[PDB]
């Protein structure tokens, strides 16, 4: 629905987000199927374990971890959770 | 030499205008590059100016007390002349400051 | 200095000037403006044309 | 109530200074009609985007404008970009 | 259609019409309407400052024909004759003023003048 | 080293989440902070034993375990200032003879702020030159580390006093972390190494505190009791840091709630305590 | 009987003057001792 | 015409393409005389379209000014003003103009007076001349305008964009291998 | 493969093979509508304008995104591609809101502009059109999200030329939102370019919101003066006030961008500016007089005073011909000395033009591949700087610093922040010894306020003597990478005429303020001594002075400025100045007459003629002149002292929207200050870049 | 909903223009006008055909 992140407390910066070690050992082999010059290419599995392990719900914070994780920008963290449905 | 040592006393400023690429100014830029270091070192603290342009006409200025001009052209002068040059003006402090 | 005045503004910007140019007939020049900008344009007002409205006015501004 | 020039005061009104008693707007564009427009109140809107030309009819008001009421904050409402009214979602 | 006196149409509710598109000011063909416009204290496109020259104002009534939200407009009012050429130079709160003294046929005469088209 | 438990362990887990500052720094963000840190108190010529003067307020929360990271890391003591007047600056001063002092420009020195009773003590700043060390009174003071946002005369800034060191041209080399150094003096008592190690263990076991346990310390962060609760614990096993320097306890509450189950180090007059998990 | 508040206020536009001291004040040397008038607050000299 | 064929003497009169020096006839020009011969030495003998430093001739009052139409008897001034001309191509804000910019050289004298007359606060200049800023197909032709005129020149070369090899190719670059670069 | 030949409208044309459709066309003066395709931006697809139809092709191709192929034969002028492109701008129109009259863009907008010439005529799409809410990004851009037509525009320019990453496309189908993801500010030093990059009135000016329209806007053409480089700019302006700025396209200076300052400050002037001569009473009262009486007064003083206690400090403000009079009216009263502070004083001679300015220019940072930075910030000091010095580290370019750690877009190794580097380098026990001098071009960058520092001349002694070791200034290669970061037009001017900066007046019983206001100390001042302040605005030196003398501001004065990579530039006199204020040499040249000493000054042509007696460099306008003797005055010397005190380095910078006094007197830079200080102020390096 | 034919296509704006030479100009003189022909090299049967295929 809204492209921008709709002013939702729920969803806001202080929200306590933190992968799993078994989302962080998960990481290994996807890392894997990219090369190490492009990690940004696991973007799609690390949205999906995202998914999966936070009810449904992908925390703007998990984002940002995602972001950090991936060292890419948070703008293209954003747009790439929004571009798919 | 000495007349080197006597231009901090002498004079208030030494600008030295020429041309990069002119015969004219040709002595004159070999003058203020062999002996640059030796003037720099005996007189540290006396402005020495230096400039080119494409088509200057070679002169240098020795501005005195009182903000004397005493531009004296150089055009096609050897080395020698410009030694000269550089007495006579570092020499005329006296009568031009009286 | 009409002439200048008109040269110095844009091409709508200097429409009245004409009426002042022809106190008595103000439609005429009008008219006149309008075919020369149409010419320059390279086209004509087909709804003034349809319309007949500048052939009534042009005879009203005569009369 | 907030001092004027403040940082929350500037993110707030777009980076300018709001005045509340419409008086200095009133002298410096010379008419009260600030305050006059600020006598209306806040209207609520059932759809998500409204289309607000001012009055009644085509060329009754001015050009017609779509004003998107959903926002990422609830109940943000928003002012015509051609008149005066503003709008605001009717529930969020 | 009588291009009377210049002036300063607004909306019902009487929020300033103008919306400081400048489209006046390119389009008196003598420039004889001047104006200086900044950001309103609630952000509104209001002009400072709204003056039109009648001394080189023709009455012709070009900022009305090309008036963007009905804001300039030519009022019936005919006896205007002003004693004083300093006077004569009407500005924003002079033109509002007339204004909102000529509204109710200025309203009528803008409804029956849309209706024409419509 | 003892702080590289959870660096070597994942090095992407998060470390401390500053909610004063809103700003979130992984184990590999606090331990980078620390190494440029210490490197440029080494190329500062900051050697073992300097003491450095801390007259922060509370706020530069995420400032204060960086500082303490950076000591830590190269092994010089650090003593906490609690100044309140001039004649207390001072004497605290005199008494520690400290290498470096670093302070919160803006923060308030009663009816003065910090920068202003400082330079009411040394008068020496104001005159130091641009480029040249500052000719003090005091015996051992040598460097001055403003929190604010200009450059202080005789004071330098603790961002350009830091240098991050690179992996390849890098030249001066870090001193080892010696367990026996040093590296607290709160309240006239002498804290090592293995004295905080082993006060964080302590009420760890005396707390009921898990490994994954986040702990929110708000208000103070220059108890050592915080320290050890704080970014001791997350370089010992991992827990979430949540510093809330100046933070109400409304919105410290609120942050709770953002959690599950915290260990909420209450800020008070009184060095910082701890609390029961949840609400 | 207020041209003059207009006046000011068009001159302000681009050609405001500068508020020099007015009367007798303080003086740090040759520097006249006033505080500036700025409506805005600068918010990185206090805070902390 | 912006460029005339430099191939043919058609393109402009070598006169028109000269520059004059500038000869001490004032008090304060004989003083400086020396630097009136080094304005004279080093600054270009030609004027062109082609050129690259801006350069300034001083406004000639002789018989070349003969054709000056702004020296009356109440207005003594404006033959002697020295002018600025520069190309004056598009604006920042849009790229493809209604009316596209760069094709006339502008020369422009600067502003003499402007103030507010405080009856409405309406803007008004003192000096009715330069309010527009004139346009000439080319440099030699603005030349020649100058010195009929009698005005002086301060012709500035504009600076254009650099052509750039451009290509959406360049949007999928292929980076490299990752030992390799390492 | 090396001369190509296509047909442009049946016209044979010879191009190269590797320039687009678009390239060819431009080149050939054929205007091609466009949207999205910037040439100094990425290359997209974005737009369909472009799309233009070929000779014995399926479908339109986009000129922009599509090269030439020999033979190949555009009808540009065919009713195909006139349907083509009435097709695209109606697509494109669909959902443009009506707010023309209410945006920023009418009378500039491409939007109308493509709709007037290459569109359709009318409107066909009667329905309801999409809105998106606005954003809110700061004083500096203005967010009009409803226009906004997602031209990649913002996020192409922010990822490739500001390099900050905050702008992208988020969402899709007909509800693609073109801001940011989160509410924040956009603080990148080139906001100024955000507005003139969008195509449609999706980012305007916001200080210059609803200000006019640009058919009553009067563009001359100056440069800059606000940043060391003096990018060129087009001031817009309307009667006697001045409306805007906007950039000028110098590939030279800075190609197409400027920084917020040169965009924003020019407000300074419209206020706390000084209109006329004060005089300023012993108890501080401050009563206009007639400027005849204030001169008289001054050359009695003048005269009474003895040659020996008479100082000045000189203004950022100052140009060649201020620079040039004030030294004249020193000389001529027997005066040698043209500076009274002695603390912040630059310690280099202006013996030597290659030692007094940066050898390497602009262009040299794309020409040179090592770059060593000590005590320069280029993303406060110049943003166009800052932007050119990534765009080369992009490509083949390894920058160093030797400073505090700074927070420049690209990655820059730090070896140091204290002088223990630099004596390690200097002795040549360092590891960046090595990749010196295996750097095909090297360069070595130093700010002017870290090479005034007290150490100024021993760290100039240490850097020239590595510069000679290392091969910064190689005849071999013919390659002079040592570069001085200047921070003052005035103090790169007065470098440039001979004045020399260490001739420092202990004691002064006259001190002259040329229009200086910063880095200055009531203590460094007698209390003694008559002062008088050549200003415009009146900030520190109003306070300083018994006497204030109203002057013309840079666009008030037709002035010469050389840039530091050695440009001259004339700046014109945009407006007048404001009140009674004369100008600077009309001032000097007054004040010689009345002291009984006169300069032979009337006119601009006898102060240039005098000028060029002086240096002949300075009539060359926009122009560089090569130096034939940058290795000689760069040559090291034995003997000379080069003792480093061990204090860390820093950038004199702190808030880059204050940093002058017409920048503290900007409103518009106020409300910067505000608002952005408090989002950019950071203690901790940034290591995700 | 005719949107593809509001500008017109066809507009009344051909233009022609007619050049001829001088009538008196003789087809030497013209020759050595356009530079066929040189001015000495006159009279001559050779060159006069040379320098008419030439033009031609
Ligand atoms: S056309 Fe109407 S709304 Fe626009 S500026 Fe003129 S009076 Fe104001
Ligand atoms: S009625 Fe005509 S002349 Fe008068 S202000 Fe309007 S457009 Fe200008
Ligand atoms: S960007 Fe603004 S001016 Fe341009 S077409 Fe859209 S609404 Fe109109
Ligand atoms: S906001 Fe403007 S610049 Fe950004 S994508 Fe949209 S049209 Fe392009
Ligand atoms: S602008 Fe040419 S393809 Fe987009
Ligand atoms: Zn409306």
Known sequence: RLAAHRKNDDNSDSVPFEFTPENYKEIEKILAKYPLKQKRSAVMPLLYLVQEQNNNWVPLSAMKKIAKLLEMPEIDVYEVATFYT | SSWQKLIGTNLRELRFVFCQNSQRSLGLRNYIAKNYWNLKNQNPNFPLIVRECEEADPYIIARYQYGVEKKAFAANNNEAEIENIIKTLVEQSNKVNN | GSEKLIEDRPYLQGMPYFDRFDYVSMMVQEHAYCLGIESLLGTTNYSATFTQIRTMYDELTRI | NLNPYSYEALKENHWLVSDSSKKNSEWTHKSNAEQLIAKVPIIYVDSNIVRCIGGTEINAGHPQVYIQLDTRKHGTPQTCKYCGLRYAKKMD | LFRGEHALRRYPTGEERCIACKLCQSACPARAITIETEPRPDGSRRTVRYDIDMTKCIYCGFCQEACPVDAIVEGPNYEQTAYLHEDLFYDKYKLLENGDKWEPQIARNIEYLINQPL | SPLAAQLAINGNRNAVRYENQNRTWTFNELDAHTNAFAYGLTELGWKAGDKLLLWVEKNHTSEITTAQVGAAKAGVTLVPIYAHSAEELEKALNDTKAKGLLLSPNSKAGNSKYIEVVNKVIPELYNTGRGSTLKTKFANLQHIIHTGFYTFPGTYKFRQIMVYASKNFNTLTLPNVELNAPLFISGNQTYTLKDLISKTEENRKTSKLNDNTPVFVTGDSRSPLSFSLGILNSLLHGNYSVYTGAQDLNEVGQTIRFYDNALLLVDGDIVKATQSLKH | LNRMRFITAQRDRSRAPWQSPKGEGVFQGKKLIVASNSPFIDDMSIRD | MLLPKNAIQSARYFEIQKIPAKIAKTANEKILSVGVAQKNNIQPKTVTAQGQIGFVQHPQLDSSCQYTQFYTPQRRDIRGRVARIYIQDTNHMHDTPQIPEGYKWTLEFERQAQYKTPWMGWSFNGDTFSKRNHYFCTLEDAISYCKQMGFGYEVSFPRSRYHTRKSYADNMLWPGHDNAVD | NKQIEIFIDGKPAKVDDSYTIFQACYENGVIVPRFCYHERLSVAGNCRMCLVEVENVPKPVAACASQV???????????????????????????????????????????????????????????????????????????????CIHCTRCVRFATQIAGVEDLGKTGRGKAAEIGTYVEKTFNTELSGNVVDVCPVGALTNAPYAFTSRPWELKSFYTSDVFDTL??????????????????????????????????????????????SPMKRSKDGNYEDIFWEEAIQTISKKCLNTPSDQIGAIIGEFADIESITALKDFLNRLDVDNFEVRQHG???????????????????????????????????????????????????????????????????????????????????????????????????????????????????????????????????????????????????????????????????????????????????????????????????????????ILPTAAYTEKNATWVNTEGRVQQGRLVVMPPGDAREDWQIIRALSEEAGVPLPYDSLEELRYRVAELAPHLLKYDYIEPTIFGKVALSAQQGVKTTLSPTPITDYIDNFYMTDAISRASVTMAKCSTAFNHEKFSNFKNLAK | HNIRYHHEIHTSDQTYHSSYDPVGETTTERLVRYGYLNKDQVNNAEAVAAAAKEFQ
């Open chain 9, 69 to 147: 192929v020999p033979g190949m034969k555009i009808k540009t002028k065919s009713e195909k591609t006139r349907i083509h492109r009435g097709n695209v701008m109606e697509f494109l129109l669909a959902n443009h809101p009506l707010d023309c009259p209410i945006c920023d863009q009418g009378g500039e907008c491409d939007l109308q502009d493509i709709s007037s010439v290459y569109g359709y005529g009318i409107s066909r799409y009667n329905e309801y059109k999409r809105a998106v809410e606005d954003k809110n990004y700061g004083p500096l851009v203005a967010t009009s999200m409803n226009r």
């Open chain 9, 230 to 275: 003096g990018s060129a700019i087009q001031v817009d302006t309307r009667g006697p006030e001045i409306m805007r700025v906007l950039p000028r396209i110098h590939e030279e200076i800075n190609e197409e961008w400027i920084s917020d300052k040169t965009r924003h400050a020019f407000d300074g002037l419209k206020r706390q500016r000084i209109n």
């Open chain 9, 345 to 547: 004083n630059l310690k280099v001679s202006p013996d030597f033009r290659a030692n007094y300015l940066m050898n390497s220019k602009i262009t040299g940072v794309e020409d040179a591949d090592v770059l060593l930075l000590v005590g320069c910030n280029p993303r406060y000091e110049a943003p166009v700087l800052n932007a050119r010095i990534l765009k080369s580290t992009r490509k083949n370019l390894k920058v160093f610093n030797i400073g505090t750690n700074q927070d420049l877009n690209y990655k820059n190794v730090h070896l140091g922040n204290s002088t223990k580097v630099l004596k390690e380098i200097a002795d040549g026990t360092h590891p960046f010894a090595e990749r010196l001098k295996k750097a095909k071009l090297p360069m070595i960058m130093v700010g002017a306020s870290a090479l005034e520092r007290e150490d100024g001349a021993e760290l100039y002694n240490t850097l020239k003597v590595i510069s000679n070791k290392t091969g910064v200034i190689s005849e071999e290669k013919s390659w002079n990478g040592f570069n001085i970061l200047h921070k003052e037009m005035g103090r790169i001017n007065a470098l440039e005429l001979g004045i020399n900066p260490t001739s420092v007046n202990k004691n002064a019983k006259l001190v002259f303020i040329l229009g200086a206001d910063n880095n200055l100390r009531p203590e460094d001042i007698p209390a003694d001594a008559f002062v008088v302040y050549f200003g415009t605005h009146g900030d520190e030196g109003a306070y300083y002075a018994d006497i």
